[PDB]
Amino acid sequence: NFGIITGVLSTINFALSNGDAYLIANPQLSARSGGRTDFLAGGQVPILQAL
Amino acid sequence: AAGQNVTYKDYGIKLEFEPRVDDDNNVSMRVLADVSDIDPATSVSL
Numbered sequence: 001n002f003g004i005i006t007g008v009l010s011t012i013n014f015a016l017s018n019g020d021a022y023l024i025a026n027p028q029l030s031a032r033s034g035g036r037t038d039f040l041a042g043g044q045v046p047i048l049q050a051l
Numbered sequence: 052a053a054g055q056n057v058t059y060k061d062y063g064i065k066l067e068f069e070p071r072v073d074d075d076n077n078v079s080m081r082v083l084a085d086v087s088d089i090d091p092a093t094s095v096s097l
Contacts, residue, residue: 032079045093051052 062087 031037067083 043090043093044087046095048097050054 062089 027039027041029037029039063086065083065085065087067081069081071079073079
């Protein structure tokens, strides 16, 4: 018995995409000479960590 | 350790004041102001 059974398959792609993102952040602070100031505008998330 | 104890976390409006006053009524202070609300988006069910 001598023969062959074969073929091909194919796919077509025409995907096209763009993306833009902009941001400005303008925090401001006041502190005295020799002091320290901390500022946070945002949030806190819970993290499950332990010894 | 491990992988219980239950503690409590404060939220809301929190304010801490520590003043000091001069002879000319100048005020030197440390002030903490905190405003924190609960967010459903980042809460975890466990």
